[PDB]
Amino acid sequence: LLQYGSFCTQLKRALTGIAVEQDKNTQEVFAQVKQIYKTPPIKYFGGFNF
Amino acid sequence: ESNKKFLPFQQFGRDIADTTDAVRDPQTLEILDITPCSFGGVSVITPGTNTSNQVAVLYQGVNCTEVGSNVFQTRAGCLIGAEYVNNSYECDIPIGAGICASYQTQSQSIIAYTMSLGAENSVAYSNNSIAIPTNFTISVTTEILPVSMTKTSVDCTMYICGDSTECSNLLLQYGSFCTQLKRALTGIAVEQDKNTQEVFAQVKQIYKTPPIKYFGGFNFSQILPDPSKPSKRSPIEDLLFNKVTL
Amino acid sequence: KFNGLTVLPPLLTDEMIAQYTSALLAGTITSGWTFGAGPALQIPFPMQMAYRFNGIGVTQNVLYENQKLIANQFNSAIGKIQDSLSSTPSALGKLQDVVNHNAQALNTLVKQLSSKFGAISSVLNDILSRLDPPEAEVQIDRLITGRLQSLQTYVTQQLIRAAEIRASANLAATKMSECVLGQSKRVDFCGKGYHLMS
Amino acid sequence: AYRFNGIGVTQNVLYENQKLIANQFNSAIGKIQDSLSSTPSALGKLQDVVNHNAQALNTLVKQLSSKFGAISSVLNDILSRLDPPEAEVQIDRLITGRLQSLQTYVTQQLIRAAEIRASANLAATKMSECVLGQSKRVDFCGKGYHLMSFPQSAPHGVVFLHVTYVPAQEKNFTTAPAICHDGKAHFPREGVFVSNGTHWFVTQRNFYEPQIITTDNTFVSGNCDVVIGIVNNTVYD
Ligand SMILES: *[C@@H]1O[C@H](CO)[C@@H](O[C@@H]2O[C@H](CO)[C@@H](O)[C@H](O)[C@H]2NC(C)=O)[C@H](O)[C@H]1NC(C)=O
Ligand SMILES: *[C@@H]1O[C@H](CO)[C@@H](O[C@@H]2O[C@H](CO)[C@@H](O)[C@H](O)[C@H]2NC(C)=O)[C@H](O)[C@H]1NC(C)=O
Ligand SMILES: *[C@@H]1O[C@H](CO)[C@@H](O[C@@H]2O[C@H](CO)[C@@H](O)[C@H](O)[C@H]2NC(C)=O)[C@H](O)[C@H]1NC(C)=O
Ligand SMILES: *[C@@H]1O[C@H](CO)[C@@H](O)[C@H](O)[C@H]1NC(C)=O
Ligand SMILES: *[C@@H]1O[C@H](CO)[C@@H](O)[C@H](O)[C@H]1NC(C)=O
Ligand SMILES: *[C@@H]1O[C@H](CO)[C@@H](O)[C@H](O)[C@H]1NC(C)=O
Ligand SMILES: *[C@@H]1O[C@H](CO)[C@@H](O)[C@H](O)[C@H]1NC(C)=O
Ligand SMILES: *[C@@H]1O[C@H](CO)[C@@H](O)[C@H](O)[C@H]1NC(C)=O
Ligand SMILES: *[C@@H]1O[C@H](CO)[C@@H](O)[C@H](O)[C@H]1NC(C)=O
Numbered sequence: 001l002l003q004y005g006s007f008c009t010q011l012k013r014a015l016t017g018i019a020v021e022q023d024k025n026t027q028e029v030f031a032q033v034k035q036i037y038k039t040p041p042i043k044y045f046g047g048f049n050f
Numbered sequence: 051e052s053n054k055k056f057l058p059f060q061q062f063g064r065d066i067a068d069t070t071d072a073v074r075d076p077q078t079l080e081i082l083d084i085t086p087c088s089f090g091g092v093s094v095i096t097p098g099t100n101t102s103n104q105v106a107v108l109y110q111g112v113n114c115t116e117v118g119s120n121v122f123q124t125r126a127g128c129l130i131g132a133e134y135v136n137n138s139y140e141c142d143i144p145i146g147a148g149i150c151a152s153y154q155t156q157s158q159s160i161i162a163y164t165m166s167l168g169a170e171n172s173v174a175y176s177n178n179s180i181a182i183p184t185n186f187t188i189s190v191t192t193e194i195l196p197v198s199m200t201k202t203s204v205d206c207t208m209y210i211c212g213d214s215t216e217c218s219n220l221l222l223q224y225g226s227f228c229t230q231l232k233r234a235l236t237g238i239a240v241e242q243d244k245n246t247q248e249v250f251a252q253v254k255q256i257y258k259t260p261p262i263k264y265f266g267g268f269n270f271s272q273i274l275p276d277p278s279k280p281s282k283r284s285p286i287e288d289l290l291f292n293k294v295t296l
Numbered sequence: 297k298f299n300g301l302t303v304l305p306p307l308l309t310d311e312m313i314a315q316y317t318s319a320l321l322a323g324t325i326t327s328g329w330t331f332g333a334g335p336a337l338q339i340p341f342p343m344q345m346a347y348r349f350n351g352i353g354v355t356q357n358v359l360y361e362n363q364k365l366i367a368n369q370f371n372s373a374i375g376k377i378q379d380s381l382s383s384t385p386s387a388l389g390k391l392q393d394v395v396n397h398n399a400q401a402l403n404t405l406v407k408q409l410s411s412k413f414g415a416i417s418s419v420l421n422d423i424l425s426r427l428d429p430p431e432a433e434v435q436i437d438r439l440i441t442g443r444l445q446s447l448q449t450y451v452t453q454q455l456i457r458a459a460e461i462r463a464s465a466n467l468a469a470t471k472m473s474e475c476v477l478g479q480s481k482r483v484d485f486c487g488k489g490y491h492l493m494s
Numbered sequence: 495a496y497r498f499n500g501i502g503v504t505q506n507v508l509y510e511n512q513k514l515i516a517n518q519f520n521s522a523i524g525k526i527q528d529s530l531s532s533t534p535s536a537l538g539k540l541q542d543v544v545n546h547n548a549q550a551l552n553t554l555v556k557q558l559s560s561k562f563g564a565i566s567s568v569l570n571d572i573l574s575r576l577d578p579p580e581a582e583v584q585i586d587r588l589i590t591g592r593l594q595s596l597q598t599y600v601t602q603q604l605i606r607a608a609e610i611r612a613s614a615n616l617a618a619t620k621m622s623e624c625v626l627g628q629s630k631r632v633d634f635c636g637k638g639y640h641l642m643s644f645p646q647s648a649p650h651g652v653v654f655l656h657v658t659y660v661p662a663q664e665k666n667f668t669t670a671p672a673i674c675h676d677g678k679a680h681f682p683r684e685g686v687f688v689s690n691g692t693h694w695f696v697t698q699r700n701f702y703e704p705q706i707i708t709t710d711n712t713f714v715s716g717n718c719d720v721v722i723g724i725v726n727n728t729v730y731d
Contacts, residue, residue: 001440003560003561003562003563004440004444004560004562005557005560006553006556006557007444007447007448010553010598011447011448011451014451014454014455015451015454018454018455018458019304021458021462022306022458022461023144023306023307023308025461025462025465026306026307026308026313026465027307027308028465028466028469029465029468029469029472030308030313030316030317031316032316032320032472032473032477033168033316033319033320033323033331033332034168034169035168035169035170035171035319035323035331035336036167036168036169036170036171036315036319037171037172037173037319037322037323037326037327037331037336038170038171038172038319038322039175039321039322039325039326040172040174040175040326044177045177045325045341046177046340046341046342046363046367047363047364047367048341048367048370048371049367049370049371049374050321050325066403067298067403067406067407068407068410086297089300090302091302110302110304111302125305126304126305144307146305146307147305147306147307147308147309148307148308148309148312165312167312167315167316167319168319171336173326173327173336173338174338175326175338176338176340177340177341177342177723178340178668178669178670178723179338179340179666179667179668179669180337180338180339180340180343180666180667180668180669180686180688181337181338181339181664181665181666181667182337182664182665182667182686182688182697182702183335183337183661183662183663183664183665183700183701183702184662184663184664184665184701184702185661185662185663186659186660186661186662186700186701187518187659187660187661187662188515188518188519188522188641188657188658188659188660189522189636189637189638189657189658189659189660190519190522190523190525190526190655190656190657190658191636191637191655191656191658192526192529192530192653192654192655192656193620193636193653193654193656194536194537194539194540194648194651194652194653195539195613195616195617195620195651195652195653195654196539196540196543196610196613196614196617196650196651197610197613197614197617197650197651197652198610198614198650199543199547199606199607199610199650200543200544200547202547202551202603204596204599206596209558209592209596210588210589210592210593210596211569211589212569214569214573216573216578216581216582216585217569217585217589220582220585220586220589221589224589224593227593227596227597231596231597231600234600234603234604235600235603238603238604238607241607241611242607242610245610245611245614246614248614248615248618249614249617249618249621249652250647250652252621252622252626266512266516267512267513267516268516268519268520269516269519269520269523272523272524272526272527273523273644273646273655284646285527286526286527286530286646286653287646287647287648289527289530289531290530290537290646290647290648290649290653291648291649293530293531293536293537294537294540294541294544294648294649294650296544296548329632332632332633333632333637333638333639333660333661334638334660334661334662335661335662335664337661337664340669342671342722343669343671343686346671355681355715356671356681357679357681357715357716360671360672360681360716360720360721360722361716361720361721363722437563448598452601455605456605459605459608459609463612473632473633473634474631474632474633474634477632477633478632480631481630
């Protein structure tokens with residue numbers, strides 16, 4: 001198989017790029033805010049149920 | 051040992067993937083299961099060579115028993131050469147499920163930790179209170195977007211056969227792949243030109259700024275073209291063109 | 297665990313995504329759309345809803361004189377959501393399609409290893425234990441070519457799928473930016489009707 | 495001033511703070527060059543295209559040295575050492591390998607060109623919507639309240655400079671939904687009711703500027719016994 005060439009390098013590069021892109025997708029979608037906000041202990045909002 | 055109920059006439063055992071997983075001993079009738087031996091990949095975690103030469107090794111998806119601070123089991127595998135701490139920082143080098151690695155002075159070493167999502171904040175919500183701003187700030191931000199790429203063309207005869215007539219005659223038998231290749235490359239080049247044409251040719255008029263550069267106190271000298279230099283580019287454009295180099 | 301095929305875990309766990317969602321919900325509940333452009337500013341919820349009605353062309357007295365009815369309607373609509381999701385058989389087919397496609401591709405790639413590709417056998421050990429070097433390469437070459445072709449096809453299919461996945465992720469990010477952190481005036485972009493919040 | 499009016503701030507806010515805004519804009523513009531120069535990977539997106547193209551071309555060129563199960567990888571050596579009848583067997587494998595390499599290169603180029611076209615379309619939309627006008631879409635032309643944008647050209651790409659307005663120095667206040675007077679409810683026309691602790695005013699959205707409550711900035715529209723949390727106080731004429 002060594003005689004054929006360097007197809008496996010291209011395959012590994014493609015797979016690694018796909019994995020990095022998959023991580024970046026979630027990072028872009030969900031990491032919008034830089035602060036972790038918390039709801040008040042009293043759950044009254046003028047009659048609205050959440 | 052196997053808990054597989056072999057009827058008195060089977061000898062082997064297969065799965066969905068159609069691979070052998072059970073076998074009976076010819077000498078003593080007993081069913082035994084076969085499992086593949088452990089295998090995996092090795093990743094090397096290191097900072098820049100300018101900083102230090104220390105490294106850490108991650109065996110992906112492996113229990114640490116099979117392979118000082120060389121022992122630490124993560125969901126991504128076994129980590130060797132890093133120390134784990136209770137503390138949480140912004141992620142520097144991703145490793146696995148919420149585990150990151152960094153080079154810290156602590157002396158200098160490589161540590162592993164759980165990534166932190168941000169700083170905890172709690173707004174004092176009330177149903178008779180409000181918050182109103184009293185002052186403002188002007189901010190400027192930058193964004194970078196690619197537009198086009200390089201246009202290339204390929205010749206079949208020179209690349210494959212060079213100047214060999216016999217090779218060209220042999221290749222002629224295969225068909226008309228080269229026509230498809232040339233069509234694809236030409237379409238790519240035309241699309242590359244059209245991208246820039248669509249992006250930049252928005253206006254049909256060439257407007258010029260007045261000679262007197264007064265706009266109520268606003269400075270636009272950093273983005274306006276510089277007549278002193280030959281290519282007539284702004285200093286920011288000069289920096290951008292100098293930074294990007296093959 | 298297959299033959300040289302491994303599955304890598306994602307960087308972010310489900311708990312971290314849940315924490316991000318909870319933080320976004322708390323911010324949009326307690327501060328409205330102020331936290332999406334700067335510091336978070338406190339405001340009572342009925343006043344925020346009145347401002348949102350003012351954003352679609354309805355005066356505030358319409359809300360302030362119908363608060364209980366609006367609250368009851370919102371509560372009923374929220375309550376119906378779980379039943380609507382549970383009753384529908386194919387409500388979440390989009391998320392199941394990705395898993396089905398990945399499993400099918402992996403199964404096909406694994407099953408392709410049993411082909412002979414015009415050779416005496418599909419097992420290398422049988423060829424090695426029954427023959428000698430000089431005549432083994434002829435049988436080995438066809439297997440090598442077939443497996444290389446299968447790998448190339450799998451990689452091309454994976455790239456083609458990843459492109460569409462990226463497009464969907466970009467659309468989802470845009471929707472999260474424009475419908476959750478603010479009020480949108482684009483028609484049929486954040487629901488059907490006059491958008492209020494998300 | 496018109497652009498500030500487009501985000502919900504009155505013109506007198508600009509006309510009374512022109513010098514401060516100009517100085518802030520000048521400082522923000524000046525910091526841009528240093529920010530671009532100091533960052534090591536600020537322009538990695540433009541370098542990635544060049545790197546990928548160079549790598550693909552280098553791989554395609556290097557693939558020419560493979561034998562593909564033949565005696566040699568040079569056609570001239572085969573031609574000068576052999577005769578027609580036995581040369582085709584060696585030539586065919588080289589032909590097949592080079593054809594496969596060319597097909598792979600073309601497929602990769604098409605796949606990359608698709609993403610390049612998508613990025614170009616996004617850039618064109620951003621240029622149309624953020625430079626030639628003022629956008630109300632959240633987080634489309636920067637972070638904050640969009641004011642304007644400036645375009646710049648770069649090797650194989652474009653750079654957008656977005657100017658945005660950010661509030662700061664907030665303060666606590668006590669508010670009410672409506673004001674009761676003479677058995678009539680009152681709602682603000684634009685703004686919100688506010689109280690410093692002893693007196694009631696009406697203020698605008700994103701800048702604290704209290705005003706005397708008057709019939710010229712409020713409307714009655716209803717009665718006092720329907721609104722929840724109403725606070726009663728005098729209204730002047
Ligand atoms: C908000 O809605 C939830 C969901 O209906 C309410 O929870 C219900 O409360 C009643 C009364 O205590 C129980 O009988 C139900 O079993 C609860 N349902 C569930 C799913 O737990 C909740 O009470 C509502 N909030 C308020 C303040 O009324
Ligand atoms: C709004 O913020 C600006 C920015 O800080 C303030 O301007 C500064 O004010 C301080 C206080 O005297 C001065 O020392 C600085 O020289 C000012 N900077 C500039 C660029 O002029 C401004 O005072 C703030 N406004 C209010 C009402 O607090
Ligand atoms: C607009 O800003 C530019 C950039 O700071 C100013 O140019 C500077 O001018 C001073 C005074 O002549 C020089 O000492 C600096 O060397 C200049 N900088 C550069 C990069 O050339 C320019 O003066 C400003 N415009 C006005 C009207 O003040
Ligand atoms: C590693 O092997 C030990 C041996 O008992 C076991 O207790 C442990 O759970 C294993 N770890 C993993 C991650 O499987
Ligand atoms: C890490 O830090 C906290 C600090 O009190 C500790 O309680 C926690 O259990 C630690 N986790 C470990 C040692 O795994
Ligand atoms: C909200 O208003 C109610 C009046 O029904 C009051 O009881 C409650 O304390 C208020 N909320 C807070 C956080 O004070
Ligand atoms: C507004 O009131 C809350 C509750 O007391 C307080 O935490 C916050 O600091 C106040 N805002 C400012 C700007 O001080
Ligand atoms: C609130 O504003 C009124 C109107 O000018 C003023 O008389 C009063 O002193 C102010 N109260 C405080 C606490 O500043
Ligand atoms: C004004 O408000 C006070 C406090 O709520 C209340 O006691 C009083 O009755 C109100 N005035 C009238 C005329 O109802």
